[PDB]
C-alpha cells in the first residue's frame, strides 16, 4: 500500500564494475584486500592534511568516512575482499535509499557535508571548479583536470558556476547507488 519500489540494479555489470574500479583504487598493493584502517588513513586523514583542513574538520571527515564504510560491513582490523565489499554496497545502498525516501540523514550526505565544509570559505557552502580540481587530485577521485571540468558541465551549477552539496549528493545517489542514467558521466572518463 504505502510501498514504493526502489531503483536498483545490483546485478548489472555496469554497477559492479563501477565499484570494482574504486576497489582497485583502494587496493593500493593490488592484493585484492583492503581494510577500514587503510581507507580512513588514505581516504580521510591524508586528504585532510593536504587540504589543510582544521583539526575538527579532519575529525568530522574521519567520522563520516568511518561510518560510511562501516555501512558496507567494514570494521577496523578486518581485511576485506571485493565480493564482500560489493555485498556491503548492496546493503548500504538499500539502507540509504530508504533513509532518503523517509527524509532521514544518509551517510553519503554527511560525507558530502564534511567535504564541502572543508571548502566553505565564506559559509555559503560552495565548491568552485578550482577547489574541486584540488580535491579530485588529492582524493584521487578525479585527478584529470578535464574530468573535473566535465563534472561541472554535467552538474547543475549556481549563478557563479559553483556547486553545492545537495546537487553533488543527488548525483552520488544515481552514480553509486541506483545506476540512474542521469548520473552517467559524473566524473567524465575517470570513473566508469
Ligand atoms: N571522494 C570519494 N572517495 C571515494 C573513495 C572510495 C570510493 C569507493 C566506492 O566504491 C565508491 C565511491 C568512493 C569514493 N567516492 C568519492 C566521491 C565523494 C565526493 C565527495 C563526498 C563524498 C564522496
Ligand atoms: Na591491498
Numbering used by the authors: 4 to 195
The authors write:
Here, we report the crystal structure of semi-synthetic Ca2+-discharged obelin-v bound with the reaction product determined at 2.1 Å resolution. The final model includes two protein chains (A, B) with 192 and 191 of the 195 amino acid residues, correspondingly, two coelenteramine-v (CTM-v) molecules, six DMSO molecules, and 341 solvent molecules. Due to the crystallization conditions Ca2+-discharged obelin-v structure does not contain bound Ca2+ ions, because citrate is a calcium chelator. However, in the first Ca2+-binding loop of Ca2+-discharged obelin-v in both protein chains A and B (residues 29–37) there is an electron density which plausibly corresponds to Na+. Ca2+-discharged conformation of obelin-v is a globular molecule with the radius of ~ 25 Å, formed by the two sets of four helices designated as A–D and E–H in the N- and C-terminal domains, respectively. CTM-v resides in hydrophobic internal cavity of Ca2+-discharged obelin in the same position but in different orientation compared to 2-hydroperoxyCTZ-v of obelin-v. CTM-v is rotated 180 degrees, so that 2-benzyl group of CTM-v is directed towards different set of amino acid residues compared to the corresponding 8-benzyl group of 2-hydroperoxyCTZ-v. Despite the ligand rotation, the OH group of CTM-v forms a hydrogen bond with His22, which is the bond commonly observed in other photoprotein structures. The second hydrogen bond formed by CTM-v directly with the adjacent amino acid residues is the bond between Tyr138 and amino group of CTM-v. However, Ca2+-discharged obelin-v also has a possible solvent-access opening located between Phe28, Leu29 of helix A, Ile42, Ala46, Ile50 of helix B, and Ser142 of helix F.
